[PDB]
Design a binder for this molecule. Sequence first.
Ligand SMILES: CC(C)CN(CCNCCN(CC(C)C)S(=O)(=O)c1ccc(N)cc1)S(=O)(=O)c1ccc(N)cc1
Ligand SMILES: [Cl-]
Ligand SMILES: [Cl-]
Lengths: 99, 99
Amino acid sequence: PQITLWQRPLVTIKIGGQLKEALLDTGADDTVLEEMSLPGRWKPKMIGGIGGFIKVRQYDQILIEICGHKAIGTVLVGPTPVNIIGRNLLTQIGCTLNF
Amino acid sequence: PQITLWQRPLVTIKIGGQLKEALLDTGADDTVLEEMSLPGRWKPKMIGGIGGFIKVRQYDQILIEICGHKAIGTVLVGPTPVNIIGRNLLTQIGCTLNF
Ligand SMILES: CC(C)CN(CCNCCN(CC(C)C)S(=O)(=O)c1ccc(N)cc1)S(=O)(=O)c1ccc(N)cc1
Ligand SMILES: [Cl-]
Ligand SMILES: [Cl-]
């Protein structure tokens, strides 16, 4: 599709059998979601910027569906104020910026 | 242009006669720049970041060029990790997300 930026570009994702709303964020290196369970190994990470840093758990090789697009990648999990889809997954669905 | 996301979408902007590098950030509602001098009066604004809310300076109707595309809009100034171009100016230059 073609997504306008007049409004926040929010999309439905499916992960861990869960449906969630998330922000497509070209400025985010990696996907980070609010607290949830994910299977497999993880390692701690600090991510931050405006207003500071937050501690997250990094899970790798996680399956996700974005707008019906299937993709695999890293998912960070922690106290983000909003669910964000980062470049690491945006590239796999072939998402680009255009003007 | 068409910008893929395998690397950060960092572009050149021009503001106050000076070139700067900035991040095209669809996750950002508003544009926020590193501390700099701008003309006119400013008003206070609180923005919600990944680690918390912070105070920044709002300057309105400022000339800024993004990848050569001319714009005039609101620019916020404050302690941001990088210059960020948000949806207020992305919309202005006709930017969309596509997949
Ligand atoms: C400086 C940016 C490159 C840092 N980030 C990415 C840009 N997101 C842009 C949206 N933001 C809020 C976020 C909670 C949705 S923001 O705090 O940067 C913000 C707020 C207000 C305005 N006007 C401009 C920017 S990050 O969010 O810190 C981040 C860092 C690591 C990962 N893995 C994921 C997100
Ligand atoms: Cl103030
Ligand atoms: Cl504006």
